[PDB]
A paper describes a structure:
It lacks the conserved residues essential for phosphatase activity and has been shown to regulate the conjugation process. The presence of the Phr*[name] peptide antagonizes the antirepressive action of [name], reverting the system to its default state.
Crystals diffracting at 2.45 Å were obtained, and X-ray analyses revealed that the peptide-bound [name] crystallized in a different space group with distinct cell parameters, consisting of four independent chains in the asymmetric unit. Recognition of the peptide by [name] involves residues from helices H6, H8, H10, H12, H14 and H16. We found that in the presence of the peptide, the NTDs move in a single direction and have a tendency to swing outward, away from the solenoid axis of the TPR. In the peptide-bound structure, two crystallographically independent tetramer configurations were found, which are formed through foot-2-foot interactions between two symmetry-related dimers. However, upon binding the signaling peptide, the NTDs shift outwards, facilitating the formation of the homotetramer, leading to a change of the interaction surface of the NTDs that is no longer available for interactions with RcopLS20.
Numbering used by the authors:
A (entry chain D), B (entry chain B), C (entry chain B), D (entry chain D): 1 to 5
E (entry chain C), H (entry chain C): 6 to 368
F (entry chain A), G (entry chain A): 9 to 367
The structure:
Amino acid sequence: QKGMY
Amino acid sequence: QKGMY
Amino acid sequence: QKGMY
Amino acid sequence: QKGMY
Amino acid sequence: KKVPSPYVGNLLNKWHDYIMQEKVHESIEKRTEIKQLLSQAEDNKDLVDYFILLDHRHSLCFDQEASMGDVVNMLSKGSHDLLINFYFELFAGDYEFFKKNYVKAISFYEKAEQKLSSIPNIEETKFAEFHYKIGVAYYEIDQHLVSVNKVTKARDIYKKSDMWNLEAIQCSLVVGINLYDMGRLDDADAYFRDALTEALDHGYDKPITKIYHNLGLVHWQKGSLELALHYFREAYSHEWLRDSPKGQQTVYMLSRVLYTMGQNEEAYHWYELGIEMARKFDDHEYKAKHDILYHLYEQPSIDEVKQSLAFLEERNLWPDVSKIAKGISELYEKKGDLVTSHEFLKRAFYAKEQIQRITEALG
Amino acid sequence: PSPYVGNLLNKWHDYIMQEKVHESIEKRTEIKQLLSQAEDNKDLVDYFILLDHRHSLCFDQEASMGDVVNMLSKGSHDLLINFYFELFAGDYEFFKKNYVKAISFYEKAEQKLSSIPNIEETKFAEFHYKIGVAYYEIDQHLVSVNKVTKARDIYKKSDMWNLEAIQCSLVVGINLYDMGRLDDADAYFRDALTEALDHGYDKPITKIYHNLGLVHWQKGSLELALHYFREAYSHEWLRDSPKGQQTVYMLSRVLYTMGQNEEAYHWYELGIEMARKFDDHEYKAKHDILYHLYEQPSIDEVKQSLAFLEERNLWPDVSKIAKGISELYEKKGDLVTSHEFLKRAFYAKEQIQRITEAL
Amino acid sequence: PSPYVGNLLNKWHDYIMQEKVHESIEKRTEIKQLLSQAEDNKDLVDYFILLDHRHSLCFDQEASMGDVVNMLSKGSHDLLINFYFELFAGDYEFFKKNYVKAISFYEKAEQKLSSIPNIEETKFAEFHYKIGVAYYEIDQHLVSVNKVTKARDIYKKSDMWNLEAIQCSLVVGINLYDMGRLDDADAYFRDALTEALDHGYDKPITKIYHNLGLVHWQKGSLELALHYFREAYSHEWLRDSPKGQQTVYMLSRVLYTMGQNEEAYHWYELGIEMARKFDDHEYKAKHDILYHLYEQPSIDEVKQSLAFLEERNLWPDVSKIAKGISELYEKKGDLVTSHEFLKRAFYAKEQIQRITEAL
Amino acid sequence: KKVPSPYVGNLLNKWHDYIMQEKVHESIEKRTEIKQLLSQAEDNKDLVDYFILLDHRHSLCFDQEASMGDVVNMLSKGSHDLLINFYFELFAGDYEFFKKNYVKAISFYEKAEQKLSSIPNIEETKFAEFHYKIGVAYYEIDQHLVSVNKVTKARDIYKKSDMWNLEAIQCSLVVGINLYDMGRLDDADAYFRDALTEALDHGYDKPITKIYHNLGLVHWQKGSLELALHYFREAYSHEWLRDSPKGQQTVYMLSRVLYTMGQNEEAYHWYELGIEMARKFDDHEYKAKHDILYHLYEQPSIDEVKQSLAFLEERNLWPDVSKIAKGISELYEKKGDLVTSHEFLKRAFYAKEQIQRITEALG
Ligand SMILES: [Cl-]
Ligand SMILES: [Cl-]
Ligand SMILES: [Cl-]
Ligand SMILES: [Cl-]
Ligand code: NA
Ligand code: NA
């Protein structure tokens, strides 16, 4: 799961 | 195998 | 008398 | 007479 | 409910193209079409400035400046020419980013960035802006080493001053998630934790929220499920997150982490909650993602786990597909079905190979 | 006059920065009417384009101006607008004959030249010439010859600028003449004269002839000076220009200085007439000097005519008129008045660089 | 090695700033002896000229240094000296395979390029290529293809740089191959191959043949891959270069993968020999994998050879070796070990971008 | 007793010329010839820097860098080339100034000034230095309007900082004497008086001394002889002035002002004192100037007043010749000899005309 920014 | 250069 | 230009 | 500097 | 600003930039560029082709109709149609939307757009100083520049060069070509004018080459022409060219490339880049064509976006951003150098007294936060835009774009296509390079170039600039504490902090967010995606979990942990201090010290709500979530993703990846669960809730505490589409990420991780420990009890809470945010935002991604949780943990069906996963691959979420299929692979191993655990490990590996192929063209 | 509309373009600039929409918009229309004459100068146009660009940002079609100083274009437009503002402020002060302020403005504009994207060197030549002429008018001859010579060397590189290059060599010529380097001045004029002839430019040929007249007048070759003054009067445009008052005046002054008082008086009457035609008080005082010297001598009225020339700060000319009178009265055996005019000629030399303007 | 003397030129730079005369002077002589070989590179010379210029200011023939930092030249020499320092520091870190630091240095030097008076664009191409190759070595393929493509577009403008332009197209080629864009990689190589042939450059033709072998190997066209690996071995220079270990190794690995175990073993023995000749532990571990897979199978010794490859952080290669072993053991009907090697191939893919260096 | 630094710069330029002509002998002779004098010269950072640059380009052409070297065009070549060209023109200008060829000096200074722009990070006092050098040179040839223009450009820069109070003050000295020579006596009075405050406030001895003398010249020119006399003594108070050749100016003015009032008593004091400084410094100018005072006020001889005046004209001191001959002209008028008063007024006028002709060539 790619992170949030 | 990576290529040669 | 100054010149003309 | 010119000035001195 | 404002109309996205990259879309308006696309029209400005189409208007600009019609002006060089000297086409009176298509320009006037784009001109009318843009002034309708320009306040309703997402306020941008750059969009207005570009519009006025195109509006004046429109008058030169077709309005004759009221039928009396001199040929277009004069002294100002040179200066206007490079401002218009800059804007054209910056907005060509913003539109491709909006469409998720990160390679093409990087090409335009890099042309625009070079022209910025030629514009007099451009102040240094404008360069930090292009470093960050390029760095985020590389990150979206999983080119993490360069991504960290550009983003820290931006962060080196924003950190030079008091007034850009918020921007410098956003830079740390992208540096951080790169380390997590690079798998340098231990460095990423320290990095996020330093950022969280600075975010707390200044009280920026959305950066604090995101650092918590990203700290959740790190320990999830480490295996520290209980600590990962702690941080995912910490992020859901923040009240704004429930209303942003980015909240789908936290609700989803909460469901996926709880199901991965025995707690099928509370996990279903978040699944039901996630499926609602899913169409509430029409997010097919997280409806496919939650249906995987369902057909894995609730009344299982592998044939249906495989097709929602197929939809994610069709959307080229190869990084996420790879980690989902890795989990399925380990699950079936924990169960003792190794033929299907091997079948999903094969799928997770094929996903890794698509990350490196880049699913878009290149010149 | 072209300095005047350039002045209006600057008033439009002032009303915009003072955020007063209506006064800005009259000047914009007044300029577009006075610009539709297609009366040369694209710079007036370019400046107008740049000012309408910031008129729009500031009042027209913009719902939020708070972000105007933060715009990206502001930096580039400011440099060009300020440049033109400074250039035209300088043209207007030159028109008013405030040569020190003109040079101040021209020089501010001159520095901005490096920073502008595509100027090629004929714009450098224009400032070289403009500054040099203003320095010439306040009698700074070496710097004047240097700036204009820079302009001519740029202009000499293109057949397209041969008229400009010739106009520069004239200003070098009159500089050498004012300095008294008469032989250099003569050589310089005749070399300019040949190729003003090759291209057949009427107005430059006329002036070189007049100036060659001044050169040989100051040398003492009166009949050769007389010939050249007539050659310049041949050109028909000159008698209808206010510049013709100089050559009509010199003709009268040269002939009186020889024996030929009857024809001298003819040109005198013609001078007095053009003086009234152009409301030129300088040339009426100059002719009143001739009259009260050579016909109906009255030393007191010569002195009042000279006093009027001194009030207009024409100190170079007062010095040479008064020195001539000084020479006449000594030849007539009167030494008290020849010495008193020599004192006045010397006092005038002392004023030449006293400047008249604020500085 | 040419990175090594560039490293010494930087130690001369360090001893000068530390004001220690003697240590500076040994390095100056050591460089002038190692420079008299006329062993190409005028940059080593130019940097030497610039350093002797500041050696003199700092110690030699100067009675008062207190005014050295105030000198006018200091500003200009500092930018060139720092540039070369950064460029050679980068060449040395590339030699040591610290690709992240090399890129850091190259990029500091790269910014100084605008500020230097007469660089023309083949110096920009050199940094484009150098940075791109370092990014390629750490598997940043898109930025690598972008930088080198910038270099080739500069090199393509001159018949004088056709070898350089071809060398750039090779690095684009291997990038596409590593990315798995095999069909683009093939097209790219053959277009490079035609005009490496036109100019008859032996070393680039050899490599394109080898790389076309890797392309069709990864495609699956084993006999066509085998043909191209032999064409590259034809070139006599290659067997004597350490680079030949790759193609000898691939020949052994391709033939074992077909039925031809006897000739495969021939190349294996030849590989083991060059491995000892060049002290190349990587290619001994790679061949030990072939041996303990296809002759005398011992899964534990295959795993130790793979473990040694992982300690050298050759994660791209460990991923593809381990995935191949995974495929073999599954075809042999053993799924526990085929799955365990697939786990190791997947773990390796995860390491590829973990970086190894400080970063 | 140091050797003037402009003279050494002339040799450096001759050495530079021999290097481009690749003449081994003449270069080596100039090289030896310069290293002998380079410490004995008037310390100058610029002279050393130029020498090293020529020394290195000497090695390239003849020493072969010890018989092993690459052709002269490389990357540094460009940077060295513009530094050497700058120095060549600056020292060509300093040498012509030393020789009192002010026109040629201005040409070189102006070429050097333009090349300074092209050298990276030249700091702004270097531009103020060229503004002042050009301005003083114009003043020496009596081009006062421009002189005031350049000198105030330098003064605008030095005034931007604390550390250049002394330099800014020297600029005021030249602005001031220009106003006096322009005859704007009243403005010059205020100007000098403001400078004297700042010179006193900071206690700079030589600027205070010169402002007093220049204040003396102003009121002398105004006619206020008694006040002029007050200030000339004030300047002679300063103890350093008696030992500099510039002191000849004050002793001379003291003699000439006292003689112009009845005080032939004390006037002779200064004449005897002036004639001694005259050859003490071998100053033919002030020996001719004082002999004019003698043959005017002490045992008069007009035939000899005219020939020492002739020597000043041969030295092209037209500004001073004009004012001396104006005084003689008024003297003979006060006496009632108008034929000779008119004869010297004619001479004073002819001098004014030579000031405007400039007694040097021009391209
Ligand atoms: Cl003459
Ligand atoms: Cl005219
Ligand atoms: Cl493919
Ligand atoms: Cl090689
Ligand atoms: Na780590
Ligand atoms: Na006054």
